[PDB]
Ligand binder design. Structure first.
Ligand SMILES: [Zn+2]
Ligand SMILES: [Zn+2]
Lengths: 36, 36
């Protein structure tokens, strides 16, 4: 992900920001959050 | 988590913010993101 990017889910509907990108995935609710 | 909170992976080194808390857990690198 790109720094300053926001990610939201479609299930849980959780929204978080990407303060610091990493070589991993942002899982959520036995799923994988979405990116805006 | 409470909005305004930031969570890290504590592994890869990914940092994100909880813009909107939901009914899900932030996972990264097969790990449960930690709270700063
Ligand atoms: Zn989710
Ligand atoms: Zn990670």
């Amino acid at each position: 992900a790109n720094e300053g990017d926001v990610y939201k889910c479609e299930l849980c509907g959780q929204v978080v920001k990407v303060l610091e990108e990493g070589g991993g995935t942002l899982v959520c609710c036995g799923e994988d959050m979405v990116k805006q």
